[PDB]
């Protein structure tokens, strides 16, 4: 079983790679087919940290506006949130500010947040340099990583870092 249950949430524009990032984390695989998420889904993975068993319940939101009411319901319980954009889609990067506003409206003020610039394997269509993602995260005081579900870059690192940071804050209380 486990010692802690961490509820995580993936948010961001439709098509940025939220489901594929989660599929890489839970199944260590990637497929190029786009199957847009209908409302919400979740996956479970249990990890070991500093002697404790951590059950991660990871909620995967649909990015399209028609699912707003469905996805809004999951901000309240969230202990960590991944804000995902697509490095080949500057509009999805600009929309990170809107996703942050939704976190501030509906999530706890102490929620752990991390920005993921996904699809970093697609440099031939890049629209956002990594420095711009780092600066956005810095201004919000949160961590940033460029990830690739396809090339298996920083997906494990992102989730373990978020869980470590949640555990560290919790342990200190």
């Amino acid at each position: 079983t486990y010692d802690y249950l961490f509820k995580l949430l993936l948010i961001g524009d439709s098509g940025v790679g939220k489901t594929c990032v989660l599929f890489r984390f839970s199944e260590d695989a990637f497929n190029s087919t786009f199957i847009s998420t209908i409302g919400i889904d979740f996956k479970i993975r249990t990890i070991e940290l500093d002697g404790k068993r951590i059950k991660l319940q990871i909620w995967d939101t649909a990015g399209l506006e028609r699912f707003r009411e469905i996805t809004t319901a999951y901000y309240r319980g969230a202990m960590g949130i991944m804000l995902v954009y697509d490095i080949t889609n500057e509009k999805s990067f600009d929309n990170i500010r809107n996703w942050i506003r939704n976190i501030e409206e509906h999530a706890s003020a102490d929620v752990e947040k991390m920005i993921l610039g996904n699809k970093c394997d697609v440099n031939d269509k890049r629209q956002v340099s990594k420095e711009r993602g780092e600066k956005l995260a810095l201004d919000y005081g949160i961590k940033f990583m460029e990830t690739s579900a396809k090339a298996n870059i920083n997906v494990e690192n992102a989730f373990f870092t978020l869980a470590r940071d949640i555990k560290a804050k919790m342990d200190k209380k």
């Binding site: 209908i38 409302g39 919400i40 979740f42 479970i44 009411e69 469905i70």
Partner: protein, 31 residues
């Protein structure tokens, strides 16, 4: 093609989907 179903209609199926998912994981573990 065009939109047809309501929020409550999709939601009720999604909530049941979620409940069954969670129940399946409990029984799978019982092993």
């Amino acid at each position: 093609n065009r939109p047809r179903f309501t929020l409550q209609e999709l939601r009720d199926v999604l909530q049941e989907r979620n409940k069954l998912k969670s129940q399946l994981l409990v029984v799978q573990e019982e092993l």
